[PDB]
Scaffold this active site. Sequence first.
Site, PDB file in Angstrom:
ATOM      1  N   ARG A 181     -27.363  41.765  24.492  1.00 44.62           N
ATOM      2  CA  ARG A 181     -26.750  40.512  24.890  1.00 44.62           C
ATOM      3  C   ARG A 181     -26.315  39.708  23.666  1.00 44.62           C
ATOM      4  O   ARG A 181     -26.943  39.794  22.603  1.00 44.62           O
ATOM      5  CB  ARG A 181     -27.741  39.701  25.716  1.00 44.62           C
ATOM      6  CG  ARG A 181     -28.114  40.381  26.997  1.00 44.62           C
ATOM      7  CD  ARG A 181     -28.835  39.392  27.900  1.00 44.62           C
ATOM      8  NE  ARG A 181     -29.326  39.989  29.133  1.00 44.62           N
ATOM      9  CZ  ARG A 181     -28.625  39.997  30.262  1.00 44.62           C
ATOM     10  NH1 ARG A 181     -27.412  39.475  30.316  1.00 44.62           N
ATOM     11  NH2 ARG A 181     -29.154  40.540  31.362  1.00 44.62           N
TER      12      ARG A 181
ATOM     13  N   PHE B 213     -46.830  51.931  26.531  1.00 47.55           N
ATOM     14  CA  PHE B 213     -47.055  50.736  25.723  1.00 47.55           C
ATOM     15  C   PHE B 213     -47.727  49.636  26.539  1.00 47.55           C
ATOM     16  O   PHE B 213     -48.720  49.040  26.101  1.00 47.55           O
ATOM     17  CB  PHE B 213     -45.738  50.223  25.138  1.00 47.55           C
ATOM     18  CG  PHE B 213     -45.885  48.937  24.380  1.00 47.55           C
ATOM     19  CD1 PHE B 213     -46.485  48.926  23.120  1.00 47.55           C
ATOM     20  CD2 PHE B 213     -45.448  47.734  24.919  1.00 47.55           C
ATOM     21  CE1 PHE B 213     -46.641  47.741  22.412  1.00 47.55           C
ATOM     22  CE2 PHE B 213     -45.599  46.538  24.217  1.00 47.55           C
ATOM     23  CZ  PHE B 213     -46.191  46.544  22.961  1.00 47.55           C
ATOM     24  N   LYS B 214     -47.204  49.353  27.735  1.00 45.81           N
ATOM     25  CA  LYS B 214     -47.731  48.222  28.496  1.00 45.81           C
ATOM     26  C   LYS B 214     -49.139  48.483  29.016  1.00 45.81           C
ATOM     27  O   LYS B 214     -49.905  47.531  29.197  1.00 45.81           O
ATOM     28  CB  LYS B 214     -46.763  47.864  29.630  1.00 45.81           C
ATOM     29  CG  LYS B 214     -45.424  47.429  29.067  1.00 45.81           C
ATOM     30  CD  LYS B 214     -44.358  47.156  30.124  1.00 45.81           C
ATOM     31  CE  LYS B 214     -43.014  46.893  29.446  1.00 45.81           C
ATOM     32  NZ  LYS B 214     -42.001  46.283  30.372  1.00 45.81           N
TER      33      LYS B 214
ATOM     34  N   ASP C  38     -34.804  39.016  45.358  1.00 44.10           N
ATOM     35  CA  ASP C  38     -35.799  40.024  44.982  1.00 44.10           C
ATOM     36  C   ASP C  38     -37.068  39.305  44.543  1.00 44.10           C
ATOM     37  O   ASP C  38     -37.400  39.255  43.350  1.00 44.10           O
ATOM     38  CB  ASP C  38     -35.279  40.962  43.888  1.00 44.10           C
ATOM     39  CG  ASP C  38     -34.480  40.245  42.824  1.00 44.10           C
ATOM     40  OD1 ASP C  38     -34.408  39.005  42.846  1.00 44.10           O
ATOM     41  OD2 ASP C  38     -33.892  40.941  41.955  1.00 44.10           O
TER      42      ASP C  38
ATOM     43  N   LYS D 197     -26.861  31.850  32.678  1.00 43.66           N
ATOM     44  CA  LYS D 197     -25.838  32.665  33.371  1.00 43.66           C
ATOM     45  C   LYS D 197     -24.585  31.812  33.560  1.00 43.66           C
ATOM     46  O   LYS D 197     -24.156  31.632  34.694  1.00 43.66           O
ATOM     47  CB  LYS D 197     -26.415  33.122  34.705  1.00 43.66           C
ATOM     48  CG  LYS D 197     -27.693  33.947  34.602  1.00 43.66           C
ATOM     49  CD  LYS D 197     -27.478  35.351  34.075  1.00 43.66           C
ATOM     50  CE  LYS D 197     -28.706  36.227  34.201  1.00 43.66           C
ATOM     51  NZ  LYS D 197     -28.638  37.424  33.332  1.00 43.66           N
TER      52      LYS D 197
ATOM     53  N   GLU E  92     -35.315  44.488  46.730  1.00 42.57           N
ATOM     54  CA  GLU E  92     -34.174  43.632  47.015  1.00 42.57           C
ATOM     55  C   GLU E  92     -34.056  43.443  48.522  1.00 42.57           C
ATOM     56  O   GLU E  92     -34.111  44.413  49.283  1.00 42.57           O
ATOM     57  CB  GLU E  92     -32.882  44.219  46.427  1.00 42.57           C
ATOM     58  CG  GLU E  92     -32.997  44.424  44.924  1.00 42.57           C
ATOM     59  CD  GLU E  92     -31.748  45.031  44.273  1.00 42.57           C
ATOM     60  OE1 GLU E  92     -30.987  45.739  44.964  1.00 42.57           O
ATOM     61  OE2 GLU E  92     -31.523  44.779  43.068  1.00 42.57           O
TER      62      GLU E  92
END
Lengths: 332, 5
Positions: free
Chosen positions: A210, A303-304, A108, A36, A318
Site C-alpha cells: 500500500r 509464527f502466530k 463480515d 479508504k 461474509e
Amino acid sequence: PVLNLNDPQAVERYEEFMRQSPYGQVTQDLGWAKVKNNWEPVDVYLEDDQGAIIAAMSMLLGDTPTDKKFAYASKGPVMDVTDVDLLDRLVDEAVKALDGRAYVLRFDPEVAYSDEFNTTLQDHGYVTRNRNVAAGMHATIQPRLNMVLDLTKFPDAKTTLDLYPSKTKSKIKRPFRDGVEVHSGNSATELDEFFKTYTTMAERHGITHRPIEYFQRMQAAFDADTMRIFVAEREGKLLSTGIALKYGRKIWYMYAGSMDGNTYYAPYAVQSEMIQWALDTNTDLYDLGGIESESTDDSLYVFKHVFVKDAPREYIGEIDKVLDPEVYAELV
Amino acid sequence: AXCXX
DNA sequence: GGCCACCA
C-alpha cells in the site's frame, strides 16, 4: 436512520457508540472512511425506545465493472449480529440508504461460526460465504480464521512472559538478550521507519504494498492512544516494525515489516511489546490476524502460534444481502 | 492484496 | 513449528 456526515453533533454521537461498544471495530469507525478515501461512506444506525443508539453499520461503497456499487461493512455491523431480528432491522435501514446503487451489501463480523447461526442467516434471505467456500485468505476479503489471544484467561498477568510456556518464554527473551530494543509512537518518524521495513519486506516477497499515504491518513484519523507503531532496532540499526490499533475489546496487530538479512528475532520483540500494551491497558483481546490453516506448512500459523496457543477463532465469514441478483451472480 | 485490512 | 526454521 441514516447518519448525516455533515452534522458534527450527530457524528459525535455515532462515534461515541462505536468507541464504547463491546462490539466496536476500527474498520467500522468513521475514521476508516478517511483511510479508504477512494470509497464512498454511507452509515446507518438504530435507536432503542429510550433514544440511545443500539446498533450501527458503517458501509463503504466501491466501484465494479458494472453499473452497480459494492457496499461493504468491514467487520460490521456493531451489535450482536446473532440477534438476527435486530440485524434485519439494521440492514433494512442500510438498504434504504443505498437507494438501489449497490448490487450487494456485504458484512463480515467477528462472530464465531456455528451451523445453527449459518442456517438462521440463510433462512432470513442472506447468502453466506464460509465453509461453503475456500482458497484460504483469498476466499473472503478478510481472513475467516484468526489467531486471537484471550488475555482474560490471565487476570493476574503483569508482563507478556506471564502468558506463556517456558519454551516460548525463551524465544521472547532472545531478541532482548541480543540487544534488540523497541520504541513506539505515532509520529511521522515512526511511520517512515515502518514504511522502510514494509516496502523492504514487500520487495523481498515480490509483492505489492500500500502507498504511504494510506498509513498517513490512518495516522491523521487515529491518535496515539488508538494507533501505535512499534519499532525494533539493535545498536541503532532498524530491524523490524509493526502497527497495532487499539479499539473496542482488542488490540489488533495489522501491518508489519522487517529488513533483509539478520533481524535477531526482532519481530518477536515487537509482538512482546504489543502484547504488553494490551496488558497495560487491560484490553481483553490481542489479535494477530489471519492464518490460512491450522498447519505447520502455513508460515502465518507457525509464527502466530508462538503467541496464540489456543485454537484460532473461526468467524461466520461474509454475509451478503443480495440486492441485484443478476450482477451478484456475475461477480460472486 | 487479498490479508485485507 | 520442528539449535534450526518461521518472523505479512
